[PDB]
A paper describes a structure:
The trimeric spike (S) protein is the major glycoprotein on the SARS-CoV-2 envelope and is responsible for engaging the ACE2 receptor for viral entry, and thus, it is a prime target for vaccine design and therapeutic antibody development. To unravel the underlying molecular mechanism of the S proteins of Omicron BA.2, BA.2.12.1, BA.2.75, and BA.4/5 bound to hACE2, we determined their atomic structures of the S (BA.2, BA.2.12.1 or BA.4/5) or RBD (BA.2.75) in complex with hACE2 by cryo-EM or X-ray crystallography. According to our previous reports, the binding interface between RBD and ACE2 could be divided into two patches (patch 1 and patch 2).
As for hamster, it is susceptible to SARS-CoV-2 infection. Compared with hACE2, H34 is replaced by Q34 in ghACE2, mACE2 and RatACE2. RBD form an extensive H-bond network with D38, Y41 and K353 of the ghACE2. Therefore, it seems that more polar interactions are occurring in ghACE2/BA. Notably, hydrophobic contact between residue L79 of the ghCE2 and I79 of the RatACE2 may also stabilize the interface. Given that Q493 has a relatively shorter side chain than R493, R493Q substitution may weaken interactions between R493 of BA. RBD and Q34 (and K31) of ghACE2. Notably, BA.2-R493Q mutant has a significantly decreased binding affinity towards mACE2 or golden hamster, and slightly impairs the binding capacities of BA.2 to ratACE2.
Residue numbers in the entry:
A (entry chain B): 332 to 528
B (entry chain A): 19 to 614
Write the structure that this text describes.
Amino acid sequence: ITNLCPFDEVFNATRFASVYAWNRKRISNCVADYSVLYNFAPFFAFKCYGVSPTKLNDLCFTNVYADSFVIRGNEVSQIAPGQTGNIADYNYKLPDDFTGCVIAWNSNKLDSKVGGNYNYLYRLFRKSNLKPFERDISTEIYQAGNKPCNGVAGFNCYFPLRSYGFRPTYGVGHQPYRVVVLSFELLHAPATVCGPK
Amino acid sequence: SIIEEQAKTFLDKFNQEAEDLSYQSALASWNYNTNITEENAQKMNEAAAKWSAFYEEQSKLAKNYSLQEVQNLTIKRQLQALQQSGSSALSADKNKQLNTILNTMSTIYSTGKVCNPKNPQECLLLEPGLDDIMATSTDYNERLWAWEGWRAEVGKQLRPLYEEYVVLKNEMARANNYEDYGDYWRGDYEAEGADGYNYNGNQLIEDVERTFKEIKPLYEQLHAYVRTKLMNTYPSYISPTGCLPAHLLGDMWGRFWTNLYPLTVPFGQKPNIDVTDAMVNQGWNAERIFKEAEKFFVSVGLPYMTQGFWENSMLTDPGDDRKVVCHPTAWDLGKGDFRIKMCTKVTMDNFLTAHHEMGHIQYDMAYATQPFLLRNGANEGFHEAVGEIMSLSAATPEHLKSIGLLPSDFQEDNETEINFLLKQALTIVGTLPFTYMLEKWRWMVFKGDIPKEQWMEKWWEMKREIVGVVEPLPHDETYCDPAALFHVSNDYSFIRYYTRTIYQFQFQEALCQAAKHDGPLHKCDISNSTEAGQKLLNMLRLGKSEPWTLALENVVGARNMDVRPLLNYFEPLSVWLKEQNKNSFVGWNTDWSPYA
Ligand SMILES: *[C@@H]1O[C@H](CO)[C@@H](O)[C@H](O)[C@H]1NC(C)=O
Ligand SMILES: *[C@@H]1O[C@H](CO)[C@@H](O)[C@H](O)[C@H]1NC(C)=O
Ligand SMILES: *[C@@H]1O[C@H](CO)[C@@H](O)[C@H](O)[C@H]1NC(C)=O
Ligand SMILES: *[C@@H]1O[C@H](CO)[C@@H](O)[C@H](O)[C@H]1NC(C)=O
Ligand SMILES: *[C@@H]1O[C@H](CO)[C@@H](O)[C@H](O)[C@H]1NC(C)=O
Ligand SMILES: *[C@@H]1O[C@H](CO)[C@@H](O)[C@H](O)[C@H]1NC(C)=O
Ligand SMILES: [Zn+2]
């Protein structure tokens, strides 16, 4: 037991990323201690699929991907395989055959200020949906009519990205939430991520 | 279609952008109201200003999507509310003229003084100057001069302003494809949907008349009782077979007859039920009062109160170097923020007002998931009808006996019930013909059936027939009696007070049959009943997404308004009044006048 994985700089980070620019970290060649993970907040959401929630520290995988972002309260249900909405259609998509865990908790005391936090953005308009595990960071103007937009905002020409504006006196369903998605893959290669002996 | 998708995208952007501005305006208003200071006002105004501007742009930019090309009803309902423009349909000069007329009328009403004869050195104002005289005094001439001065000093200055007010508002109404301003007000009841769920503004007149023709006999009986009781205090000024003088109805305009209870009490040796002494003895505060209402609401199967409700609400007078507006109100600031402002004292009236306001809060929480522009009550009468039934249910001498404010061996006599019903009648039944007559007169004046040269004649010819009130002194065409009322001179609708009274009782009946209640209707408690709460929440969660006919059907079982529950509520009192009026005349004539 000498190569503990760096899960502490994925849950204790000082600044998370927006939904449309979600952050991906690849974890390989370490021993994974899936028990410090329980030491954090009451974990409003600790739901996961294809894997026993109590016997993770018994099986070996070739790679673990951690994706981090911040969403709203009444959108955590959209982080699940086979769902339709706004976050799950234009921002972040999960495959139907998903093997991994979804963790989500509350961050009102950290990501909410009097006056509004306008640093968190999400996409509102897109021409087509997203294939699973895909990113779009373009800022071209959405065209909704026959008239060509020609690089200027106006009638039937919308800027595709909008903000949240969190304030401390909001309700539970409009408060900030931090979400980490862990995806385990097992490919044809030597397995290099395993639990403690 | 193609226009429908563009409308959907436009509404998505509007909904995204409007929540923030509305929330900022609401928060500024709250901070001003709970903390009165000069610089807290300016910010408020600024916030409000921005909101207006935003709306004033979108209502134009939303007129470019033809409404007939949208087929799905929710999008059409959202877009129609946005497309409606009011005073913006006129030019700048006429809008400025209308605004300067309205401000002048409001200012004249607010600062008005009636100077007493007999050493006119101390003149009285309106609010704490004449309400006391007209609600407490028992002197004929003292009431007469106060009644006449308010019409001869404030009513005669509002005639020329009103005459051109009407002309401006009719043109503003015709600028929006209407016939008159009365149609503009009656169009709030428009409903569009499937077959049999439609409703225009012309059916409201017929429904109101149909309901009043049934309500009238009970009013006649109550009128006869009050007439035969007022002859012991004004012997020579009342005819046994005539109308009632206007300045002897316990109010400045006669809107409410509550202040006649000391003179018309059936049995004066039996006091009413008051639980203030028990509340003070046991030891109660505002928090206990507001928690005993949350228990009532969660008894029937409704959600608890939000945590932010207990932290962001002012339930007591601060009692420090901070000035607050002391008037109960329930605030829905948006984004899951619900608050209540109220100066709470340990009394029974505050105990009932808490239920009334938490009814509004629970109504707001039900449709918080609906989209913007569809996040209001079904019409302008549902919101108070929900609050009033809770107050009715939380005041019976069986709910108070459960919470421990009355002895466990308390038995109710039949003498107190008659007194309670008479007090309720004097404030419910006695205000319906007044509202009907006022709104009918205003509709006729707007539409043109009443020419300008015959305004007060129609007033004191309709009041002597519909209501039964006769003027003390002659009034020619120089006065404007209706303008001496707060709602008439401040651009406010008045029929919302007529429909609500009809609605509430219906609701109560539907919530007393589901609760398996056996007995008279005025002793119904819907606590510890889950099916009643579920049936009510079936209607609470819609909002404006569906026509109000479907919302009414979801809770009552009928698609329209009827008066049978109201008459069922007041049945023991009707029997008692009929028994008590054998040797008396039921009715009135329109030929007797105090001045002639
Ligand atoms: C984050 O840091 C805190 C205290 O330093 C503690 O909960 C733990 O070390 C970290 N939490 C996780 C989930 O790694
Ligand atoms: C009331 O407003 C003043 C600003 O005029 C502010 O300083 C004060 O803190 C406010 N009261 C409270 C309780 O915050
Ligand atoms: C949108 O409406 C304005 C009027 O406010 C009009 O001038 C403009 O041409 C319209 N745009 C269209 C029809 O594309
Ligand atoms: C109309 O629009 C609403 C959007 O709120 C949608 O749910 C519904 O399926 C659409 N069609 C009908 C027939 O209501
Ligand atoms: C309602 O149920 C509670 C719980 O048993 C009971 O104490 C109470 O007496 C019942 N009735 C009323 C009117 O609260
Ligand atoms: C009340 O009940 C008593 C008991 O019989 C009866 O004598 C009396 O007439 C009743 N009074 C009313 C007003 O019902
Ligand atoms: Zn109210």
